[PDB]
Amino acid sequence: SYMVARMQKMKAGNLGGAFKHNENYELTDRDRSVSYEKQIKDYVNENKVSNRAIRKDAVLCDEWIITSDKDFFEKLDEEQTRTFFETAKNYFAENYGESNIAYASVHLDESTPHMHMGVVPFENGKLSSKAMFDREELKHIQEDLPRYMSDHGFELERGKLNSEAKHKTVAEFK
């Protein structure tokens, strides 16, 4: 099985539909009655160095999907499946910051379990997805995250180095 880790950028106006999608169990200590957009805006406002307002097209967070193939999870019981997602959340907390993980919500139902984890790209007083998740950082995640998971006893191959596959969705795959 391959580790599946991929991100999507979320602006204010994407965060609303994702909060509703995800009411599922939530691994962070977030207050489950405050919206993603309000939680992240308070946090950035309360900490950013700059006195300018957050730009209207800011990436407020990088939503990572973490999962693998169906048969990988058939091999795990529910305790071990939960620890798989907690272990993955630990990797991103240690490398990007504890207080940046705004949500880590796991779907555990009809399909293969998938976690949607919102990582705020706030480093050094500055909100910038561009600075945190650049081409080199993404290469490094595809190499290093599967190695970390294997060290915790979850046997995962890294994705094909320089893979030429394109991201597909069900509608487009038809």
Add this chain to the structure above:
DNA sequence: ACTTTATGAAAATAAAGTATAGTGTG
């Protein structure tokens, strides 16, 4: 490399916006 944004105000500037790297299923 190029464009959009926020700024006590630009006939202008800097910081962050645009993808990125990766597989799933049947």
